[PDB]
Structures are given as C-alpha cells and as structure tokens.
Amino acid sequence: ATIYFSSPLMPHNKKVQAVAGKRSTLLGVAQENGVKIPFECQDGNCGSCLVKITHLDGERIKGMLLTDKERNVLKSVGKLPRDLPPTYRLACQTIVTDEDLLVEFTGEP
Amino acid sequence: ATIYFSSPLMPHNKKVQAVAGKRSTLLGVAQENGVKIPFECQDGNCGSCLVKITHLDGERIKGMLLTDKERNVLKSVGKLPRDLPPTYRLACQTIVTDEDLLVEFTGEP
Numbered sequence: 164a165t166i167y168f169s170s171p172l173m174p175h176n177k178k179v180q181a182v183a184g185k186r187s188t189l190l191g192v193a194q195e196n197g198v199k200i201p202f203e204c205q206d207g208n209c210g211s212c213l214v215k216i217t218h219l220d221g222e223r224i225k226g227m228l229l230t231d232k233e234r235n236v237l238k239s240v241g242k243l244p245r246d247l248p249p250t251y252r253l254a255c256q257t258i259v260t261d262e263d264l265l266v267e268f269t270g271e272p
Numbered sequence: 273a274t275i276y277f278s279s280p281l282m283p284h285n286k287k288v289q290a291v292a293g294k295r296s297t298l299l300g301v302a303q304e305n306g307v308k309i310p311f312e313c314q315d316g317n318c319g320s321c322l323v324k325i326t327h328l329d330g331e332r333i334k335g336m337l338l339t340d341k342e343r344n345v346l347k348s349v350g351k352l353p354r355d356l357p358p359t360y361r362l363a364c365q366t367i368v369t370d371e372d373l374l375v376e377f378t379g380e381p
C-alpha cells in the first residue's frame with residue numbers, strides 16, 4: 164500500500180510504501196519513515212495521533228474496526244461517525260492494509 | 273506522477289501512472305485510462321470537467337496557471353479562489369506534472 168502522510172507540522176507530505184500483512188499501524192509506519200509526531204502513548208488513550216483518512220485506491224476492509232475505547236476517544240474529540248468518505252481514526256490503532264490512503268494528522272496534542 | 277481519479281459516477285477510484293512532460297491534461301489521462309466523463313467540450317467553456325484537486329506528494333508548479341477564461345468558468349460555478357490546500361480546476365485545462373494528486377470529478381454536467 165502507498166500512504167501519503169500530511170500534517171500542519173510537516174512542510175512536505177511524505178509518501179511511503181508499506182508492506183501489508185505485518186501487523187503495521189499508520190503511526191508505526193509513519194515513525195518508521197521518519198514521520199515522528201511529537202506526542203504519543205502506549206495505551207491508545209491520549210488521542211494525539213488523531214488522523215483524517217481519505218481513501219485513494221484498493222479494497223476497504225468491511226468489518227468492525229473500532230474498540231469501545233477508540234470510539235470513546237473519538238467521541239471525546241467530536242470525531243465519532245461502497246462509497247468511502249473521509250473517516251477519523253487513532254493512527255496508533257489503524258492497521259495497514261492493501262488500501263492506498265491519504266493520512267492527515269491533526270497536529271494537536 | 274500517480275493520479276487517483278474519483279467521481280460520484282465511478283464505483284471505484286482509478287489509480288493511474290502518468291508520464292509527465294508529454295503535455296498531458298487530467299482529463300486526457302483520465303480518458304486514456306478508461307475514465308471517460310460523460311460530457312466534455314473542445315473550447316474549455318462547458319465546465320463539465322470541474323475537479324477538486326488534493327495534493328498528495330511532489331513539487332507544486334509555482335506559476336499563474338489560470339487563463340481569464342478558466343477563471344471566468346470557475347467563477348460561474350462558485351469555485352474561484354508552501355502549504356497546498358485543495359483547489360478547483362477544469363480538468364481539461366490542468367497540465368499533468370510530477371505531482372501526485374487526488375482528482376475528484378464533481379459529476380455535474
């Protein structure tokens with residue numbers, strides 16, 4: 164999958180080729196490619212990795228992808244929701260698939 | 273350049289690899305890859321090819337890209353305007369460069 168990372172904190176977007184099937188996350192791939200957001204956490208509760216995801220190409224994975232915790236974090240920042248509109252996720256919880264994506268970090272802590 | 277075409281009239285987006293430097297347009301590349309919008313014109317006045325363009329990667333070409341005619345067509349549909357926000361263009365007037373793009377047709381005649 165090809166992922167384009169964007170952030171108010173990045174002067175340029177970063178285009179990354181990611182191998183699906185190795186249990187990678189959007190945040191892990193970003194850091195692995197030198198896209199190191201300033202704040203993160205180990206329990207998926209901080210919300211700092213919030214991203215707006217735009218579908219570019221490939222199959223979307225039809226399935227319940229949000230744990231109760233991620234849903235509660237998204238609700239607490241006002242972002243709880245075959246056409247594919249932009250969707251909000253915690254990047255540290257978002258599993259990389261074969262889908263090509265535009266991934267926009269919000270930049271707030 | 274990689275271009276992702278999207279339209280309310282397309283069930284799936286279409287990812288295209290385009291060679292820059294051969295005086296290609298977004299509409300020409302789309303048709304060349306089987307993305308044939310239903311309506312078009314030869315004088316760039318019909319407005320049917322209106323697209324919303326999102327920057328994905330690569331250098332943006334800094335230069336006056338809009339003729340008076342395209343500006344007037346864009347104004348007539350309410351779409352006249354190193355950070356790169358989404359911009360509206362006539363796809364038949366938009367020259368392909370090395371920039372990777374998401375290109376969304378509006379779908380209206």
Ligand code: FES
Binds near residue numbers: 203
């Ligand atoms: S890095 Fe803390 S919620 Fe994702």
Ligand code: FES
Binds near residue numbers: 312315316321
């Ligand atoms: S195809 Fe008519 S203005 Fe572009």
Ligand SMILES: [Mg+2]
Binds near residue numbers: 172175176
């Ligand atoms: Mg940026």
Ligand SMILES: [Mg+2]
Binds near residue numbers: 281282284
């Ligand atoms: Mg579509």
